Amino acid sequence: RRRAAPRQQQRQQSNRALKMSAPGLDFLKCAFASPDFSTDPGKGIPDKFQGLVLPKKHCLTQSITFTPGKQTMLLVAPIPGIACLKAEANVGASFSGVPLASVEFPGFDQLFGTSATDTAANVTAFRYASMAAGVYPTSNLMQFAGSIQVYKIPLKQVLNSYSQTVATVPPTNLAQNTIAIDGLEALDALPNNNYSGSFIEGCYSQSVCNEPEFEFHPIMEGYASVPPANVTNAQASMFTNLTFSGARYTGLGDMDAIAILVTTPTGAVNTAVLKVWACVEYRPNPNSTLYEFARESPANDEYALAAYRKIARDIPIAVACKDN
């Protein structure tokens, strides 16, 4: 048979047609095995809060072509509308000034709207249930070359301070603030907690909640880039900047960012298909269309949450394509 051959060595992606609460089990399936399931958004989080929520499952299927002689960063951060942020840098270089550009999940404008000036219109708050990503290579075995390495970055949002002197009769100094994101320096790091492997076996990784409890965050308006318009990385006291073009920075969830560093050497044809999964619980605004689809967050399942923490501990940092 012509294709039983390099078919399977490049991963397949989708084929269609113990005492826990069902939603608690579903929570686990979603958190750790999203690809194995094409099902509706698992009810949400089997945690204390039992109010009206809109369980939404975000999925991005997008083919990527990595440029030769450059390491490309696919930062999967828990930002509401956006799937991931991408950046490229020469093989030995640092992503210092390098802006990380957004790759949004489908239908951003129906949820958050065109301008950030109206993002919290349909949804006022969010919370992250899961976040997973996988890179399925579609290159031939005779031309690829390179490595996929994965590790996690604990980036958290802060309100930094800077002083800006405004020109006037006698110049004046303004004590200014700016929202920024910590730990971006980690883009240049390869922690002792990484997955290094050949490019031909793309990865699969997922992150879990980095906080004792799953709390609700408000949806931020007016933010088109992380260090907002008219603020320099230096003023915002941050490493590099995050840019969102047809989207806007909506906020940061409580998950560690999955950092996938694909490094394609000169002359290598490295292409793949990136898939990102993320279940976010949003508090629907009575003024939206999707308010009708809102359902109550599942009842607290202390056992599901207990398994969540164990399964998360023995789990590998990242795995190869075939084992997702």
Partner: peptide
């Protein structure tokens, strides 16, 4: 094999202690 089957054996080896 699938992360789900893998998840289960961890969960199933004995989550309680």
């Amino acid at each position: 094999a699938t992360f789900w089957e893998r998840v289960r054996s961890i969960l199933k080896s004995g989550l309680n202690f």
